[PDB]
């Protein structure tokens, strides 16, 4: 693929090619753990993808292999900056801003695919989970660590995981903090497919292209519909929001607008009350 | 208004005029209690209204006053035909088919307004509740009777009532089986407005007309949206269904249709992936 | 089995034998796509099955093989009659009446089993999904096509699917519009069992008989309970409706009815307030 | 009424009369604040009432007036024994056992009526909220104090309050920590009725007697149904639990039991599959 | 108050004083309708407020009176820039970005109070609703207009409104598109208090100061708890996120961090498994 | 090294380190529970909950029986089933297993079902509501309600669906078939499968991996999982844990001290974080 750099960052790499964006967490010396700046940059990059009318799919992955030969998607919050009440940014502010990133990935009307090679651990595991889809390399390793390292994600990390692998397996994952292979992760329902490491990016590109040939309006409505099964009124906001969008493409709707601007009463008399 | 009979029934009366249909429960010797046939006919009448592209609003009310001077919207299930496991129809089958009627009124994409003069009691009270709106006459009397007469409605009768008057008041209504005035009913939030008896139908017509001047598409989407706060996936079905409806009016959607019929790949390349 | 024709239709075939009904979509020249009339007839047949006190289980399947040797359960909405805002009926009205069929299948207190040979695609796929159970032949092929053909089902097609195969696999199914084999469908959780094509009906009959040897009241309560995990207040309506049904079979409840009819205060004094 | 002491406690008083139980919080020197012992005892008394087949209604109230002439329902958690992580019991164990009491009151199949004279503040306010009904004396004063005293009830204290007074008023109550009169509390929807201080107990008894003349089975099903609008699967458990109870009173149900005991196949062939 | 300008914008004004921020929509020639830029700026200012450790409360209001003597909070989407599929920004992109602003106001851990003088109509009405609290001047006018002007808000505008005024009144508001006085709005439950126009800001400041003397941790937890009753897993994310925040302030939690950094197994053996 | 912790008629109850073991001991009825069995089970689980050293509870059945067969639990004892419920010795109809279900589900300790042989009917639902399930390869799972004139439309239905999905959950209940340990794992309702003589050791092994974790983290997580299912009751548990943690902060303590000292609280130093 001919990837073009789209913007420069300190902790990540960001590329575009056709309708695909690629976001790479680039802190291999920390197994691609995120510090607050990493989350800020990830958020910025995902926002850019959201605003780009040409991009329909974002591939999210980690830099590797590292000098020690190991692969990693993301090892979660950088523990070396963890202080009282959160992860300390350069101004001394404790933060949990990955929560904001989680929501953006979840709600943006573009499909996000996690491409996992090596470790997807802790907060890194939850990031893989909230991505729409996950493609794993056969060397991928999945797991949570919260109860061992003094943390937990009781939001999407728990409930949404249960909506993927079911309640028994979700609890096992969090309580024991074991590691799971790519094959185990696929069998339990949380990984869509598994390929060799050297095929991981091309598979992502293949899946991305099958989506890029579909109707953008259809895709965004379906993504909202899936969220609507989880996120109550916030889910309804996204789903109803797309209904409003589509309604704003109708003549019936436009008559309401035109009537207001022309200071006359609207005339919906020709329009039927359908069953 | 020039109401014209639209179809003949044994237990009810059914009229249409302009964009309004009027359905009248007609068993005043039973304070308008419904027997299984009454529910069958009500259901049929609402279906007819649903199918008529000219009808946007349905007024539901009870026949009166009766020979005793009393008014009644509906007194619920006819206890005189109640047998083992439900209300016995003319074929000997026990039924709780008012549940089907509740669902039809609740889901049909037309506004239904209960016009309550006199008693709306028991199953008759639940009917008023599931109508979109309620306009009451000053002589209206509301209440549940289940725990006194060996019944209960633990479906929309309970949960949906709580979404109207709040949990404290809903529990009071059901546990004590007291009666409530039109003013008390409005104050608690379950009656939209109150007018003198002789003004009841005309108020109904005025409210119907204010809705009939609105966009049918906007109205149906809103009704689905309101149901969506209550009915989980069934509510999602109605709201997403309207999104599908609207999407079927877009050129983007039509390309998908035409491509299939012409046995060619669709080309959505021109359409943007909006924010 | 000695199937007996139960009623004649244009687009479907309808049989009964013992406690089993069999409904067959009969438009093999369109891979059994449904037009509005097809849905009307399916709805009528399911209502009949619902009304028949002898029928406990309904088998739903597609006519085949076709003259080209191919099998199909259902290929979804007939694209050849699709117009603005829906599928255009013979009177010129745009419809999405499959939504009503979905609700009927989902809520009727009889077990519905989809018998899928060959294609269950698009709206045909959602139909299989909303059936209680699915038995597949080895030649079955499952998938959604919405984003490719300019449609989507963001109701039961999305949310309820996620409650079967989990969020990751449900999104994949819709975003990519691939086809899935029977073994794949079974592994992901949406097909209950797989058998050879010529053993499909006999498998359906056997499963039906195992249900028919059970308590009808127990089965209906369970079906409502499953819906209740999905359909919010609509689900409560079904579950509470069954509690009412059962309560109408009690002596305690009848004392309430009798008291009213005999115009005396009820006497529940003998009855305990159990823990 | 002739109240009889039913069991002796240190921190509360417990009486019975006919089908009514009365539980009185008795620490007037602390405006009836609860310490862990108080909660243990309250739980015990409510359990007793639950196990007593003669008791249908429980009245909950505070001892008063105090020597200063002041009335109090309950001032919440006893701050004088609050320590690290909770309220410290006599063994040094930090506890939040009022959460267990909230659940018992909420789920027990008997109606609980809070009789509030004077202060219902903090955890004392939440206690009034979770009781089925609330009757207030003219001198009643309601409010939350968490954000002022370094606490919060983000459980039934927040969500369930919103289901009573609506989201705007519920947020106001908690954010500002003001006090509300009986009239204000009634108008907002969280108090069922208001009576003079010296009529409070008689009003409680009158409401209780109106409940005690109803069907105990109807009442328990209704209470479960109301919970089911709030408590997801736990609510389904209560409601389905009652359906099971009712089914266990049927001959159809008994056929299953007998068949098992007699080591024979059950015969449900005579029973219909109702609509 | 000595308000200080905090940042310069085109469509709005932004001030700070003590723990209070004030955001003023400043397009009085359009009754304070928002165009995409207005939303962009509102979003930025609310983000600024969120990031300011000194700000606990945000007052949101409209500029007025206008040259015509009229007051307005906000009249919703600027119809003069509405085009196909949304509101057209300065780059030609159709947007519904008020949806993003809604989520920010709803989720940010500071109390937002709408100060409504004059019109809060359509999208402007939904903005007032999603603020935590609303204080109205006695000249305030509330209402929705969607079905008249060819729009609807089927997200928070519908469901969340029902959680404030109940289902009956919410439907009325949307279906008829009438106007409601401050008094009617308070009576129905969606306005917290009403004061004279000349007292509106001082009342806002008064309420803000009562919140500013409270515990910030308590307030954020409560706000998340209220959202959790509406927003399913998204609500859980906020509520669990705060639990994580608090857990990150515990010694027990830090031991997990330290063990990881020091490359040793954690020792939680000293910590109890509390009831 | 198990130590008897309390004596019961229908069950056995032990502790060792941070693990409690509760054993249903009515093998002559395939460990069916009568109201007393449930009362004792509730009592034992309450004990475990109240025991500050206990972090994990293993639940299992006595076996093998004299007929060589294993059983976790065969559900409600049909031999005492009467009108409206299971008749206790004072003549009262009961459904008190529902109370046990809630206790197991809500207690801030991990409960692991160790299933050898039959987990059937109400016994099957008990395994389901336990946090985790470890099965021996001879384990057999299933529901029987519609066959024996009962049903569990609460956690037995909805919660099962949140484990195996709607299609499989309905199959299980409608047909009342039996499922192997391997089948149970493949569908998602069993965490792992081992040989029968390795069953207890696997449970102990799993318990220990949990006992080395943070008790606060584990309780918050269990509540968080319940919250995806139990609406406001789930919120009560989750928010309750937030309150617990807030009661460990200085900020929170200022509010208490201020009240006790009859002075206005001073939270002025504390930030309004993002
Ligand atoms: C990822 C894993 C399993 C890999 O193990 P291994 O291959 O053995 O690598 P190693 O552990 O040796 O790590 C290599 C270097 O990267 C650092 N490193 C790795 N992960 C790090 C991290 N998360 N923070 C800081 N440094 C890290 C290491 O400390 C080490 O650095 P040096 O000693 O060479 O200097 C293994 O490394 C591992 O278990 N990492 C920890 C993962 C973890 O526990 N994450 C959860 C923290 S909580 C969280 O993510 C979170 C944050 C916000 C909101 C919610 C949340 O749940
Ligand atoms: C409605 C009410 C309060 C009116 O009282 P009142 O003005 O004193 O009239 P009265 O009680 O004298 O009744 C007049 C005649 O109509 C009959 N009548 C009135 N309502 C009836 C009914 N529901 N069934 C059969 N006959 C009825 C009466 O029996 C009486 O007949 P006669 O003595 O002249 O022969 C007062 O009449 C009253 O309280 N009726 C009871 C209403 C009630 O308790 N409904 C609960 C049944 S449960 C239900 O609605 C339901 C059904 C299916 C599914 C779910 C459900 O919740
Ligand atoms: C089913 C499938 C995959 C089979 O492929 P194939 O075996 O190759 O058959 P072929 O494509 O040649 O089709 C055979 C004939 O049946 C027609 N045909 C098949 N399906 C049709 C349909 N759904 N409508 C009209 N004509 C159809 C075809 O046009 C063709 O006719 P002729 O050339 O001989 O004239 C393959 O045929 C296929 O993919 N069909 C379309 C499936 C599809 O995209 N369905 C969903 C549309 S949206 C939906 O159902 C829906 C409905 C309600 C609510 C929400 C919704 O999303
Ligand atoms: C209740 C109220 C408003 C009454 O005011 P007032 O009439 O003026 O009485 P006063 O404040 O003087 O109190 C009288 C005496 O009772 C004690 N007292 C009153 N309430 C107490 C309490 N809750 N704990 C310990 N001692 C108490 C006082 O400290 C005082 O004792 P002495 O000086 O004579 O020694 C006014 O007293 C008041 O606001 N009290 C505090 C109420 C409060 O803030 N409760 C919340 C605690 S957090 C919570 O309840 C909670 C706990 C567990 C779970 C969830 C929860 O939400
Ligand atoms: C607010 C209201 C009721 C006041 O009426 P009035 O006092 O009589 O003022 P007037 O109607 O004359 O309007 C004054 C000027 O401001 C403009 N103006 C007022 N509102 C405007 C608006 N929303 N957009 C553009 N220009 C506006 C007017 O066009 C007029 O301009 P000029 O003629 O002098 O040039 C009355 O003005 C009124 O009803 N306005 C429209 C309210 C409305 O229908 N809002 C809904 C739009 S849909 C939406 O908000 C939305 C957007 C995104 C997502 C969800 C959503 O619901
Ligand atoms: C478990 C199972 C499949 C074992 O089969 P098998 O190995 O062949 O043993 P067998 O059937 O011979 O039973 C052995 C003895 O234990 C008794 N026994 C076994 N289970 C019993 C039980 N549950 N109650 C009373 N006695 C029992 C039997 O009657 C038999 O006794 P004797 O002949 O020696 O006298 C097989 O035994 C079996 O299917 N048992 C019945 C399981 C069942 O249907 N449970 C459903 C009750 S519903 C419930 O649990 C419930 C409770 C509360 C709320 C909701 C609910 O759904």
Author numbering:
A (entry chain E), B (entry chain A), C (entry chain F), D (entry chain D), E (entry chain C): 1 to 275
F (entry chain B): 2 to 275
What did the publication describing this PDB structure actually write?
1, 4-Dihydroxy-2-naphthoyl-CoA (DHNA-CoA) synthase, also called MenB, is responsible for conversion of o-succinylbenzoyl-CoA to DHNA-CoA in the biosynthesis of both vitamin K1 and K2. It catalyzes a multiple-step intramolecular Claisen condensation reaction involving two high energy oxyanion intermediates and two keto-enol tautomerizations in the formation of a naphthenoid ring. The first crystal structure of DHNA-CoA synthase from Mycobacterium tuberculosis shows that it forms two eclipsed trimers organized in a homologous hexameric assembly, in which each monomer is comprised of an N-terminal spiral core domain and a C-terminal helical domain conforming to a canonical crotonase fold. In addition to observing the folding of the active-site loop into a well-defined structure as previously seen in the substrate analog complex structure, we have identified a significant reorientation of the C-terminal helix as an additional conformational change caused by the small molecule ligands.
